Every structure is written in structure tokens, then in C-alpha cells.
């Protein structure tokens, strides 16, 4: 019942630079190359899809 992964929509973004510094910032660049066709390396981690951008997001993000 409702298996929606996509967290982000991505319209188009304002591209913000935030003093937290946040992989939002970040997934602007970097699902740009997803959606143009080809596959961004985030970190050593291989991402083809924004579905794969989601476990580097989450990995990065609790990396402390």
C-alpha cells in the first residue's frame, strides 16, 4: 500500500549552501548526472539511481 521510496522530487532545486551542510546540497549535483544518464561516484560509493543515492544519503548522514 503505497511503496513510495522517492523522498525527493527533485523539480529543479535552489542549490543552497547551508552552515549544517547537508546532502540535499549535495544530491542537486549529484542526481543531475542520474537524471541526465549516466552514474555519479558519492564518497567511492557507485550510484546509478536516486534509489542508490538513498543508501549513500543514509550511510554518509549517520557517519560519525
Given at each position: 500500500?503505497?511503496?513510495s521510496h522517492h523522498h525527493h522530487h527533485h523539480s529543479s532545486g535552489?542549490?543552497?549552501r547551508g552552515s549544517h551542510m547537508d546532502i540535499e546540497e549535495i544530491e542537486k549535483k549529484a542526481r543531475k548526472i542520474?537524471?541526465?544518464?549516466?552514474?555519479?561516484e558519492i564518497a567511492?560509493?557507485?550510484?546509478?539511481?536516486e534509489?542508490?543515492?538513498?543508501?549513500?544519503l543514509e550511510w554518509?548522514?549517520?557517519h560519525g
Open positions: 500500500m503505497g511503496s535552489l542549490v543552497p542520474l537524471e541526465k544518464g549516466d552514474s555519479i567511492g560509493f557507485e550510484v546509478r539511481d534509489e542508490d543515492l538513498k543508501k549513500i554518509l548522514r549517520r
